């Protein structure tokens, strides 16, 4: 098994459109691009299909310094967040990346 990859085609504010070569993923499906390009990790959730191969995706962080037609990895599902006893006494953003600086979080499972 392999993972799906797409290419950016336009960026307007938070909105970004992602061309693919296969079946478009469902709506609210997460699309990650590596942190080497933007300087920080970057996730975008599909909202709105435009054709058989385009996928409008709203962006949750700053899309600055994001070039065109960069590769973009489909997570296979929507935003999986941590859950559990380890979650307590911590702070998490929307993607489940802790921002309180207090080390990693030792979770067992990760629910959408």
């Amino acid at each position: 098994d392999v993972k799906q990859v797409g290419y950016v085609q336009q960026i307007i504010g938070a909105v970004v459109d992602v061309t693919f070569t296969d079946s478009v993923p469902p709506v609210l499906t997460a699309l990650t691009v590596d942190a080497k390009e933007t300087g920080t990790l970057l996730t975008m959730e599909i909202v709105q299909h435009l054709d058989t191969k385009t996928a409008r995706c709203i962006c949750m962080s700053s899309t600055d310094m994001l070039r065109l037609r960069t590769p973009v990895v489909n997570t296979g599902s929507q935003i999986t967040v941590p859950v559990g006893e380890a979650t307590l006494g911590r702070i998490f953003n929307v993607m489940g990346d802790a921002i309180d600086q207090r080390g990693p979080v030792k979770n067992k499972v990760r629910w959408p």
Binding site: S23, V24, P25, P26, L28
Partner: peptide, 8 residues
């Protein structure tokens, strides 16, 4: 099943 509809 609007969440489960796609294009293809």
């Amino acid at each position: 099943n609007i969440s489960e509809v796609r294009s293809g």
